[PDB]
Symmetry: D2
Subunit: 281 residues, 4 copies
């Protein structure tokens, strides 16, 4: 099942698409729905027609409905390094985390700092080099069970971070610092999570300013281990998103700018598209 | 005005004490109440008797009422360094932040990871050296206006941090990682914020295991500046707590242990007391 | 448009059927929906398939959905005589009301005393002669504007009434004293309200125990006048039902009994069917 | 305990006075509170000072608080005759009810048609002779257990009724047709319900236009019996008011008029005062 959500005259309506192109309008809250599905694959709702999922993907709105975040995730958390700066004993903090038993885990966002397909991501007013970070993300219940997968953009102000790692939070958490969607796919829609293509394109005035790709079979730090360290002594709410870290990193000249289009593709999920918007002083 | 809150048969009731020892039961939500006060000092409620604030402070419960967090703060954020590790060009990341224009700001907690007076703080199952960090904290509205002050304990797993700064989040954010109270005092209850005594005591089986004190006149990074960087491109909800960083740091042999009592005193606020509880595997 | 409602695992879902047999799942509350329609005929929802209105009519349930009252009407009111007992000066109270400027208006039910298609109506434990009263009913807004029409059964303990008119309330108001449905049709679905056939059948063990019919062109007291006296100094909530009085009255030997089936048909609306259930002592 | 309620800036606050003049602010909903009390006399709340019950009684408002209905009763029901018109076989319908096994019971009001101490009762635009009916009233739970007592004014358009008993509903049910308060007293505050004085005064421009009194020891139809017929096959919600019928009836020249003051006194309860307001066309 593939879950999405629209905003229609101030209210949400959630839908699920089945493999056979049939759309179900959801009865339940979508987080609640995902949970039921991971139990017995049962789905409460009515089959609808006249809902053009394919058009929504391309055009974002259609009459009085607009696509958006598939769920409001109570908490978003990130993983780091799963594929002239700070060093401990001539070893770089990043390569140290790469070896150590303990993976990097950071707080990414609250739901109101996230955005969805066809909404704008943001570049901090004071960031000189902000990069999108294309990542596989998992939707979790409170026991760290995987309720499904989605594309996330861990938008990061890389310049503020390289300046000092103690700025990582400021570099990671702010309005529009995070985008995800356009769907959440259920666990069975992905036979093997370590075998999917992730592809970033940046588009400047029609111009392909950056392109790059990589496969999840090149992920060192396994997802279960990331989940284990996330939840250790740390209770998470149902519907939490964990973003598993990126493997595609543009150069220092590829910083984002106002009006750019960021497009991210993951196999079996779809393509997340977000305009970029530079904030002001 | 000094605001506190109790839990009585599954429900909250908020009270305010006025300088003249008269207790008002609150009509409004306490965050909403704080906002009104910072506008015109008006307070909606009834004068109550038979509510023993002084006993509550000492004994935590009394009949069917128990003191707790004075508010549920939608977000808690921390400030760092306002008074053999990682270094950028032979300069330590901490001393670099100390000089730079940009202060350290980190995400501390969500409301359900916080606790109050007479409730237990926690030591991560996998932390070998967790220290309490006694700090002045401010309650904010969405424009970063100061609605009031309180004592906070930024409980931190210092060993996980010194191991690698990329572990700072894991070291800072977990169930019981944060305590505050026992009251929130309104802005006028503190004539000069840079002139107050902060005092930490740790108590092990009746034994004063650690004691230390310092005055806020020794704070380098001013509060307004911390607030400014917090809110920059980063929208905060009403009732957010910013904890302004600690100046009292026990040695490496002073790690917390199960059943310890942590007591923190700040002038004009009161004394926050929390048992400690080591988590398991 | 023709509105109905089902109960599915403890929750309601409202649907509307359009003349062309297409079913819309409702976005809004159905009372709210009716109001919008009487303004501009606009309907907020999604076209559904797999909802078998025609089967629901016949079989009441289907999988996990069951038909019921089309709305919860905040108030139900009745009209009387619009087509050896009590007399004022040798004139019978009923024939007096028939002549007078002022029509009879009585309080009929609250929503929890009403029932719908395929649910049981009730006969008071202490009633010896209870008759169903088949009537055209109107759904009203607070200004007494007609939002639509439906079939109502003003179930009445005629024996308690004929004994004394001061017992009329006891005779009219009790659990299961009132049934309506199976749809509410919008005002435009009925070109002329004074030109419709009403037909009562009572069914005892398969046996047609009573049958009778009449046309609304034989209604003396016009609906607008009934509405006018209802709302005079008497504010009604949105979604109130006014039942306009009956013209079909079985004899004294036709009292209802446990397990009877009451079936009522009105042109363009449909057929309301309710088992009967005698209460106990 | 004696329960009352005020309206303060758009919100309710309920209070209870104990015999010893101490006022408790209520924790619970007041209907819920009454129920608890009838179980074990336990009361959840805080003792308040600065709430001038005695002034509220006299002056209705005080600063930003105003007295009103003590509860919102989901349903109000009335009893009749418990102490040239319509006749069955030369016997008057009223004297027939007086003898019969079955008492009169009628639907009186919904909560939004009721008003309280110091609010205006209404006279129907089209009523020529409306009388107040001073009555003892009981607050009920769903099993018809008596949760307490209060004064009610069954305001009745006697002229519309005497014209035809089928107009009784129109005569009884309309905006402002019903007033009650100023308190609800708990069952133990009244040792013997059949031993209390009820006193009506009507006041026209300072002038005592009517006065009269009677004692409940002159009530024929006992309360339990009224309750029994009320609840028979007729489920009532918690907090229902049953008004037990009046024994004080002014003459045909004593019809109410705009600006009158109606004052009703019942022993151990208090004095209900309501201005009168004639409605228009
Ligand atoms: O700088 C630490 C964050 C690393 C990260 O976000 C990633 O690898 O995706
Ligand atoms: O390690 C960074 C946090 C510093 C801090 O919390 C403080 O100074 O209070
Ligand atoms: O007895 C009065 C009620 C009359 C009535 O309900 C009707 O005519 O439908
Ligand atoms: O006319 C019937 C109502 C009688 C009544 O309300 C009373 O006796 O109080
Ligand atoms: Mg990342
Ligand atoms: Mg700190
Ligand atoms: Mg009828
Ligand atoms: Mg009466």
């Amino acid at each position: 099942m593939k879950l999405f959500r629209v905003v229609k005259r101030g209210y949400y309506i959630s839908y699920a698409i089945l493999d056979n192109s049939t759309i179900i309008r959801l009865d339940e809250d979508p987080i609640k729905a995902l949970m039921r599905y991971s139990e017995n694959k049962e789905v409460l709702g009515d089959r609808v027609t006249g809902i053009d999922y394919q058009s929504l993907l391309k055009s974002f709105q259609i009459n009085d409905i607009r696509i958006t975040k598939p769920i409001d995730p109570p908490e978003v958390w990130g993983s780091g390094i799963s594929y002239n700066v700070a060093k401990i004993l001539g070893k770089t903090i990043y390569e140290k985390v790469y070896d150590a038993v303990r993976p990097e885990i950071f707080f990414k966002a609250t739901p109101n700092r996230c955005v969805g397909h066809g909404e704008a991501i943001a570049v901090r007013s004071d960031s000189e080099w902000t990069l999108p970070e294309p990542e596989l993300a998992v939707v979790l219940d409170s026991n760290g069970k995987i309720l499904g997968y989605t594309i996330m953009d861990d938008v990061s102000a890389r310049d503020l971070e390289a300046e000092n790692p103690l700025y990582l939070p400021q570099s990671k958490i702010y309005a529009g610092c995070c985008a995800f969607g356009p769907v959440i796919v259920t666990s069975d829609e992905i036979k093997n999570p370590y075998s999917l293509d992730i592809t970033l394109k940046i588009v400047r005035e029609g111009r392909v300013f950056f392109e790059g790709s990589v496969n999840t079979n090149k992920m060192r730090r396994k997802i279960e281990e990331q989940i284990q360290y996330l939840i250790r002594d740390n209770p998470i709410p149902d519907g939490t998103i964990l973003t598993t870290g990126t493997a595609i990193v543009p150069g220092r000249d590829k910083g984002l700018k106002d009006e750019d289009i960021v497009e991210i593709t993951i196999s079996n999920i779809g393509t997340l598209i977000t305009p970029v918007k530079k904030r002001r002083k």
